[PDB]
Amino acid sequence: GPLGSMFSRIRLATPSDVPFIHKLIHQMAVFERLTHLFSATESGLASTLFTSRPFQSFTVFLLEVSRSPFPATIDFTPFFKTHNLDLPIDDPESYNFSPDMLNDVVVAGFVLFFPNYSSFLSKPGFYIEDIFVREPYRRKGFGSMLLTAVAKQAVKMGYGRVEWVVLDWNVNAIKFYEQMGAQILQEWRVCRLTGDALEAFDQVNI
Amino acid sequence: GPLGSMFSRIRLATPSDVPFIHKLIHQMAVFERLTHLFSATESGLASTLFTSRPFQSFTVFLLEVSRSPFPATIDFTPFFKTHNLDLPIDDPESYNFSPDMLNDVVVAGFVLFFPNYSSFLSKPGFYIEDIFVREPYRRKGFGSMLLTAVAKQAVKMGYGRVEWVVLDWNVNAIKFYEQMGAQILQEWRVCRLTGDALEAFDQVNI
Ligand SMILES: CC(=O)SCCNC(=O)CCNC(=O)[C@H](O)C(C)(C)COP(=O)(O)OP(=O)(O)OC[C@H]1O[C@@H](n2cnc3c(N)ncnc32)[C@H](O)[C@@H]1OP(=O)(O)O
Ligand SMILES: CC(=O)SCCNC(=O)CCNC(=O)[C@H](O)C(C)(C)COP(=O)(O)OP(=O)(O)OC[C@H]1O[C@@H](n2cnc3c(N)ncnc32)[C@H](O)[C@@H]1OP(=O)(O)O
């Protein structure tokens, strides 16, 4: 009949997850219309994302789903949840996000984040560089669980804020963020030094 | 006669510098018209800013000036520079920023920053939370030296970008940043979860 049962898990990524992280970021570059900025490599992620313990620096939570439940127990333990969703999900790219041949596990989303600092609170926070759910799985609460995971971690460590940026035009994301209780601030603009501009400072003698 | 000699030093802050850091942040809250957000304490900065080695996490460079030169040598060594500036500087609040009675050293500015991550480059960068020069010392190149110090560090560690935010209206800062070669991006807006909004996620069971 119409509905079916589905299992979800949110866990920390390991370096072995780099292929799926890479692909998710790519899909974000496509959605953001910023593929011209996308030069990420798998070896780059593997080399730079995991040089510290989780939560101390760059950290990733992965969301996986499955029709079969996960194994028992394999500063954080995974969140598990059981969903009643509709018939099968149409996910053509499923094979691109499957850790295993003999397996119906699929990576459905992620969040990538790290400690920032609020000057004015004298308190660390978390900044979310990426949060993303693949198209087939949207509007089912998964983005909520991902943001909730980071928020809870922040409250647990007594951090002052969680922050990120959103595109001007991205109405759907903005409604999501406001529904989660975020304020969209109008007064700040991002400033960036990069490329030749950055490199030029290597010669400057002051 | 009109001009005089002046010595500058840029060094890493230690926890002992917290009083001056606190006061600088306060002046920024005043300038930004955001004193209503200012709840920083000295004990908060001392407790949260120095839990890691420099450059691994939250890091501060202080700018000090003096009419007398600094002592000899007391991943980084301090930058020193000699300036020919005009008569005395009128600095009423000088005593608030002086490390020592018997001493004409004064803290004139700072930058507070930490590692961020560019998804799309798969490369860490630095994010500047604060950069500031006190009023009496502006338009003398000191902001340039401060930004240069962070930029050089980034190039040395092979980071992809240096970034920060600027207020909408802050024409003088924007001209400064553009002169340094930064691009001011128009499309990003900052999103923030904080206060009760953040705390509420402590009860949420998902
Ligand atoms: C660079 C940028 O500007 S954005 C980069 C990432 N943002 C993106 O837009 C990428 C593409 N989209 C996504 O990844 C996802 O849609 C997310 C992460 C934004 C949201 O995650 P989802 O799992 O789709 O959202 P979730 O189901 O948890 O939605 C929570 C609530 O948001 C609110 N909401 C309102 N409008 C919307 C909307 N258009 N889309 C999603 N949620 C919405 C609803 O109250 C919803 O609850 P409901 O399903 O009962 O109506
Ligand atoms: C939240 C926000 O939006 S901003 C928070 C921090 N920003 C602030 O505005 C705080 C108050 N101001 C300051 O702290 C300082 O003015 C800074 C940090 C912005 C700049 O540092 P300074 O030491 O004043 O700048 P510096 O002397 O290095 O200026 C470099 C170049 O910027 C360019 N520039 C152009 N217009 C300006 C301007 N109005 N102010 C400063 N530099 C300017 C010039 O080319 C200048 O070189 P020049 O002196 O030969 O003309």
The number of strands of chain A is 8
User: How many structural domains of chain A?
Assistant: 1
Q: Which fold name corresponds to the CATH topology of chain A?
A: Aminopeptidase
Radius of gyration of chain A: 19 Å
The end-to-end distance of chain A, rounded to whole angstroms, is 72 Å
What is the string of SSEs of chain A from the N terminus onward?
EHHEEEEHEHEEH
Q: What is the multimeric organization of the chains shown?
A: homodimer
Count of alpha/pi helices of chain A? 5
Residues in helix, % of chain A:
25-40%
Bound molecules: acetyl coenzyme *A
- Approximately how much beta-strand content do the residues of chain A carry? 25-35%
The gross shape of chain A turns out to be globular
* CATH architecture descriptor of chain A: 3-Layer(aba) Sandwich
How many strands, what sense, and barrel or not for the largest sheet of chain A?
6 strands, mixed
Strand order of the largest sheet of chain A: 3-1-2-4-5-6
Quickly name the level 1 CATH class of chain A. Alpha Beta
Structural class of chain A: alpha+beta
Largest interface, chains and sizes: A-B, 77 and 77 residues
GO molecular function, one term (chains A, B): protein-N-terminal amino-acid acetyltransferase activity
Organism (chains A, B): Arabidopsis thaliana (Mouse-ear cress)
Subcellular location (chains A, B): Cytoplasm; Nucleus
Catalytic activity (chains A, B): an N-terminal L-alpha-aminoacyl-[protein] + acetyl-CoA = N-terminal N(alpha)-acetyl-L-alpha-aminoacyl-[protein] + CoA + H(+); L-lysyl-[protein] + acetyl-CoA = N(6)-acetyl-L-lysyl-[protein] + CoA + H(+)
